[PDB]
């Protein structure tokens, strides 16, 4: 029939698959990220650590150009000193966990580059809107 349990995977379902098939379904890891007298305080400090580290990822996402769009292009070019890999491989050769080792030095340079490339784009949108 229509609707089967084969290609409709679950949480962390495509965790070994290639990036071109992991970016097909990103919402399944997205929605299970917030919901799911001293052992009540083990409940409190487990809850306010979940809603805190969710908001922290929604803030670093927020101050770039991506409010809730969940996939978004940007303006910074890709300097080959970061990864030096071909484009035609890294969407069907590697997998995401193999990528996260391959780049982990160069984050906080990209995260610093993204904020300035947004705030430069933000006021330049205003200067276009101000003259007209």
């Amino acid at each position: 029939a229509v609707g089967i349990g084969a290609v409709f995977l679950g949480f962390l379902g495509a965790a070994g698959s290639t990036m071109g098939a992991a970016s097909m379904t990103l919402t399944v890891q997205a929605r299970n990220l917030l919901s799911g007298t001293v052992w009540g305080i083990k409940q409190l400090q487990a809850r306010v650590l979940a809603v805190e580290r969710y908001l922290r990822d929604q803030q670093l996402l927020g101050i770039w150009g991506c409010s809730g769009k969940l996939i978004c292009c940007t303006n910074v070019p890709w300097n080959s000193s970061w990864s030096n890999r071909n484009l035609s491989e890294i969407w069907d050769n590697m997998t995401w966990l193999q990528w996260d080792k391959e780049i982990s030095n160069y984050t906080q340079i990209i995260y610093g580059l993204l904020e300035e490339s947004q705030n430069q784009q933000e006021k330049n949108e205003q200067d276009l809107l101000a003259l007209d």
């Binding site: 299970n32 990220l33 917030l34 919901s35 799911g36 487990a46 809850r47 650590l49 979940a50 580290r53 969710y54």
Partner: protein, 39 residues
């Protein structure tokens, strides 16, 4: 043994006076499922 006659004392009476266990509670093992929090 506290050292005729023969008079003893409790062994934990030196250095640690300690509680009873209420017979309402029970020391049987029940299963415990450890779960990760969100994220």
């Amino acid at each position: 043994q506290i050292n005729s006659n023969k008079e003893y004392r409790l062994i934990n009476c030196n250095t640690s006076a300690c509680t009873q266990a209420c017979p309402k509670v029970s020391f049987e093992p029940i299963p415990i499922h450890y779960c990760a929090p969100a994220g």
